[PDB]
């Protein structure tokens, strides 16, 4: 008995290979700008641009041609549209709802996953509506999140992804989608979303997010979201939490998603550009997700990877 034997030759290695990454596993997050004919580079994320809707529709031709199953939209809210009440979240003319209708019309088979969250619409930037002590009120925030989820479903979104970490929001959003007849709008719960330093570059583009030290607690997060009606559950961030992906997949045997966040992408790309890491690291970082038990991966590398995989 010697484990080096199946490694000796590529064919044996290929036969015993436990996981394979394909384009079916890739979800491309995209930053969406208001206006027309807008493209902006993000210095903290090389190779990634914020795009106005007209320019998103053009780039999406190639994403659809590459086989990318879905996009996750993250609108870039004009400063003037942020408020205490986060009303723009549910504006039928907000960027996300306009972008959803445009993409659903132009590319009917492309999955659109919208972001249900109040932080892009509050002046203070927090994931909810504040009480008089500056604490994010859970239930009152959920009422706004519910209206937002409904406006996404009305715009045609096949998937709504509540990223807010309010307790009970998955059931509250499900109940509203069910009462309104949006029977088939999927809910992708950000179940175990951690208070992480890896988010730094997304912001350029503790009382509610999880403590990085906690593993068991993630299981209780996901059990609640499945009970409350999530069709998919997600871990965020990604690589730094692969152990959490593995336990969530092993324990619940449900569709499990993972977000390779902006910071993870920045780190990898910076190292690649400096010549410190070979470009093959991209596919390796993506394989790690599959190996850990992810069914799908939100990654800003989705285009580059779909290109390498198509060849």
User: Is 246 among the annotated ligand-binding positions?
Assistant: no
Q: Which of 21, 25, 60, 176 binds K ion (CB under 5 A)?
A: 25
Q: In this chain, which stretch among 16-24, 39-47, 150-158, 224-232 interacts with K ion, using CB under 5 A?
A: 16-24
Confirm or reject binding of residue 119 to Zn ion (CB under 5 A).
yes
Which residues are bridge partners to 236 per DSSP? 193
Q: Which residues of 161-178 are buried (b: 16+ CB within 10 A; e: fewer)?
A: bbbbbbeebbbbbbebbe
Q: Between residue 181 and residue 200, which ones bind Mg ion under the rule CB under 5 A?
A: none
d(CA 26, CA 69): 7
Q: Identify the H or E element spanning 186.
A: strand 186-193
Give the strand pairing for 45-52 and 70-75: unpaired
- C-beta neighbour count of 136 within 10 angstroms: 21
Q: Which of 33, 221, 247, 303 binds Mg ion (CB under 5 A)?
A: 221
Whether residue 290 lies in the annotated active site: no
Whether residue 193 lies in the annotated active site: yes
Q: Identify the H or E element spanning 31.
A: strand 26-33
Q: Is 283 helix (H, G, I), strand (E, B) or coil?
A: helix
User: Is 311 among the annotated ligand-binding positions?
Assistant: no
User: Is 12 among the annotated ligand-binding positions?
Assistant: no
Confirm or reject binding of residue 164 to Zn ion (CB under 5 A).
yes
User: Is 203 among the annotated ligand-binding positions?
Assistant: yes
Q: In this chain, which stretch among 14-22, 105-113, 159-167, 284-292 interacts with Mg ion, using CB under 5 A?
A: 159-167
Q: In this chain, which stretch among 35-43, 133-141, 161-169, 199-207 interacts with Mg ion, using CB under 5 A?
A: 161-169
- C-beta neighbour count of 232 within 10 angstroms: 20
Which one of the listed residues 236, 249, 290, 303 is annotated catalytic?
236
Catalytic residues, by residue number, are 193, 236
As annotated, the binding site includes 203, 221, 262, 300
């Amino acid at each position: 008995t010697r484990l080096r034997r199946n490694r000796r030759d590529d064919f044996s290695r290929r036969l015993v290979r436990e996981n394979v990454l394909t384009v079916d596993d890739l979800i491309l997050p995209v930053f969406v700008l208001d206006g027309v004919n807008q493209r902006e580079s993000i210095p903290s994320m090389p190779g990634v641009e914020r795009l106005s809707i007209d320019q998103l529709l053009i780039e999406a031709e190639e994403w659809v041609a590459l086989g990318i199953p879905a996009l996750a939209l993250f609108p870039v809210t004009p400063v003037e549209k942020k408020s205490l009440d986060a009303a723009e979240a549910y504006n039928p003319e907000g960027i996300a709802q306009r972008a959803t209708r445009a993409l659903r019309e132009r590319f009917p088979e492309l999955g659109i996953i919208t972001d249900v969250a109040l932080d892009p619409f509050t002046t203070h930037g927090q994931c909810g509506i504040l009480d008089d002590d500056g604490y994010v009120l859970n239930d009152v925030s959920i009422d706004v999140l519910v209206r937002q989820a409904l406006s996404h479903a009305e715009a045609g979104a096949q998937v709504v992804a509540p990223s807010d970490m309010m307790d009970g929001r998955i059931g509250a959003i499900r109940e509203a989608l069910e009462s309104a007849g949006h029977t088939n709008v999927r809910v992708m719960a950000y179940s175990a979303k951690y208070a992480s330093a890896y988010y730094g570059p997304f912001r350029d583009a503790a009382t509610y997010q999880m403590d990085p030290a906690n593993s068991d607690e993630a299981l209780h997060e996901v059990a609640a979201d499945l009970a409350e009606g999530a069709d998919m559950v997600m871990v965020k961030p990604g690589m730094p939490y692969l152990d959490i992906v593995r336990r969530v997949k092993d324990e619940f045997r449900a569709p499990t998603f993972v977000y390779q966040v902006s910071g993870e992408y920045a780190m990898h790309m910076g190292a690649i550009q400096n010549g410190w890491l070979a470009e093959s690291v991209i596919l390796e970082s993506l394989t790690a997700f599959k190996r850990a038990g992810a069914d799908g991966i939100l990654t800003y590398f989705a285009k580059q990877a779909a290109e390498q995989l198509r060849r």
